[PDB]
Amino acid sequence: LALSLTADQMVSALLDAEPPILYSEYASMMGLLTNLADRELVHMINWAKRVPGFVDLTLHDQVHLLESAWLEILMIGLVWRSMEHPGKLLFAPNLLLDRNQGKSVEGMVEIFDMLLATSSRFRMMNLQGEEFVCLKSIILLNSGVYTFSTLKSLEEKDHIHRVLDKITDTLIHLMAKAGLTLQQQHQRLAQLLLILSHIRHMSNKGMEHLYPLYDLLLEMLDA
Amino acid sequence: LALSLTADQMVSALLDAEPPILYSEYASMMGLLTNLADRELVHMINWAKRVPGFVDLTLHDQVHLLESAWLEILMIGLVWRSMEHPGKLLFAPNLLLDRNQGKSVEGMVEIFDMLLATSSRFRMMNLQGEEFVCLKSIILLNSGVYTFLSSTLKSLEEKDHIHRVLDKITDTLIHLMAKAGLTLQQQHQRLAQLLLILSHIRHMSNKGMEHLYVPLYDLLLEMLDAHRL
């Protein structure tokens, strides 16, 4: 069980599960981002399976979690790799775009600015890679949890909450190691989890304009 | 002022600021729900003005925060007062609805279920009143925070102040947990659990907004822009 892993073992599992940074393959704009996202999703599915506690869930529940988190997950990766590129979003090393090039779509402008603002927040906070991988894991486990009343669902949520607790402990550990005081540790933990609400929001806004999916992701998880 | 408060002072100030519980005035049901929400907004504004640090902000920034947070705030109040009624949503003491009453309206069963689920979660965690008021204040200060239109010096000043207040509220939550006997581990875990629930509350507001949809901006503005007569 994921529940007996030490903090160091958890960080180390998450660091080893990290997908690679993918490249763009080249109006053409949405085609290029569509193609990049779809390739990313294949690696995300494999990363998911390596997140401690994830394959303990039913196949149905795994698919639910991925259906609910996949865009937030692409967004937090985007924002992470954009940290060192103020004013720009590094979709791929060969696809670094600004809000002006974001205007080139329909409605994504304001979301572009939101993504840019999250990136600045991370840079400002000096988010570490070890912290980022825990955040990503938290999104995967958390996003779909409150939308799976049977007894089995009740077991599924309890497991997720215990794995989530383990990831909280891991985050606090990293901060402790980094030399922050206890007051700085609770404050930074809160600040990062609050950013996860903003990521949920950007994801919702992203979904409204990019528009079943569950079935598509089921075929993928199977494949 | 707000930044000098102790945790105990923050909590008293938050408990003192709570709005009243309103009654339903009597789809008949969407008309009822709409009237209720409209009347609660007026009190929500008075409550927001008593949230430590809120009235230090510009009028424009106050309006933005409420425009971003208002449905989140109505929802978390709903979930809080639904806690003692498993399976039901207490919109008002004379308006307790179950999930099947949601279907009687165009597309809200999914949100209904999400709301009951959050209520159950709060129940399952034994959420305290003191923790509830901190969470509601966090929502207000956080929801519109990363959507300020500008990166002006003033705006930078505003953002910094809100982050300092948010840190204070986090300090106060930890404070309540330390006094309830929780170990450091349990304190950080419970903190995280509660903050993750805000992510779901955001989601529910966004979905609720889609389903629901004089511009709201103008109405909060008029309502918040009070004379001193």
Ligand SMILES: CC1CCN(CCOc2ccc(C(=O)c3c(-c4ccc(O)cc4)sc4cc(O)ccc34)cc2)CC1
């Ligand atoms: C099983 C299905 C999976 C999805 N397929 C459709 C493919 O969808 C997508 C098409 C485009 C984008 C996108 O533009 C991306 C982001 C975004 C979206 C909306 C918005 O307003 C602002 C930004 S962030 C981001 C990060 C990346 O690393 C990669 C892409 C994006 C995203 C998805 C269909 C098959």
Ligand SMILES: CC1CCN(CCOc2ccc(C(=O)c3c(-c4ccc(O)cc4)sc4cc(O)ccc34)cc2)CC1
């Ligand atoms: C100044 C403006 C303010 C808004 N007016 C428009 C009208 O607004 C609203 C109309 C209805 C509802 C609502 O039904 C409520 C909730 C909800 C919303 C959507 C959904 O899918 C499921 C539940 S939760 C909740 C909690 C309450 O205490 C009170 C109501 C609700 C909410 C707002 C117009 C004037």
